From Swiss-Prot:
This is Myoglobin. The keyword Heme applies. PROSITE patterns: GLOBIN (PS01033). GO terms for biological process: oxygen transport; removal of superoxide radicals. GO terms for molecular function: heme binding; metal ion binding; nitrite reductase activity; oxygen binding; oxygen carrier activity; peroxidase activity. It comes from the Eukaryota. It is an enzyme of class 1 (oxidoreductase). InterPro entries: Globin, Globin-like_sf, Myoglobin. Heme b binds at residue 93. Belongs to the globin family.
């Protein structure tokens, strides 16, 4: 779905996330939860949080941010040859967690936001381009597996 040049850019950018996977992970989830409060309800571990401050002071949330970005990073490093790593992820988000693909769209957007926020001026037009496409590829492959399961919504 991407050229090596574009994969090259995705992994360059990923290097920025890797310098602080917890702070990036936390800011992604807070952006998600504050822009779409209904997503919070999918987590029994975090639905207690009400304010952004409480979210900001939650170490467990930072922990989960790490788990998420660790797993994404692992997929991205496969440069599209991620069937093995993605399948389990699509299966648990569809039948156990009951996560609509729109929420994956939401988090995808939330990653681009955060990158711009944390790195104003050094998250280029080409880098946005490649990152967006990889996130889309990720989303599409998930959508394929959702379809097979009839996870309709
Ligand atoms: C970048 C996209 C995502 C990645 C890489 C990711 C990754 C993970 C991983 C690795 C786990 C734990 C293992 C498992 O249960 O599969 C997990 C758990 C979970 N995810 Fe995601 N996830 C993503 C998006 C989302 C979104 C958008 C939602 C909801 C809005 C969500 C809701 C959950 C929930 C409810 C759990 C169970 C948490 C627990 O009780 O510990 N995920 N996710």
């Amino acid at each position: 779905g991407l050229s090596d040049g574009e994969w090259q850019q995705v992994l360059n950018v990923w290097g920025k996330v890797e310098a602080d996977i917890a702070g990036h992970g936390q800011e992604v989830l807070i952006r998600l939860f504050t822009g779409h409060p209904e997503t919070l309800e999918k987590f029994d571990e975090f639905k207690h949080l009400k304010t952004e401050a409480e979210m900001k002071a939650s170490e467990d949330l930072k922990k989960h941010g790490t788990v998420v970005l660790t797993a994404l990073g692992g997929i991205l490093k496969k440069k599209g040859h991620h069937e093995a790593e993605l399948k389990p992820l699509a299966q648990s988000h569809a039948t156990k967690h009951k996560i609509p693909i729109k929420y994956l769209e939401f988090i995808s957007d939330a990653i681009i936001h955060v990158l711009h926020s944390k790195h104003p001026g050094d998250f280029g037009a080409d880098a946005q381009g490649a990152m967006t496409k990889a996130l889309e590829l990720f989303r599409n492959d998930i959508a394929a597996k959702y379809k097979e399961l009839g996870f309709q919504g």
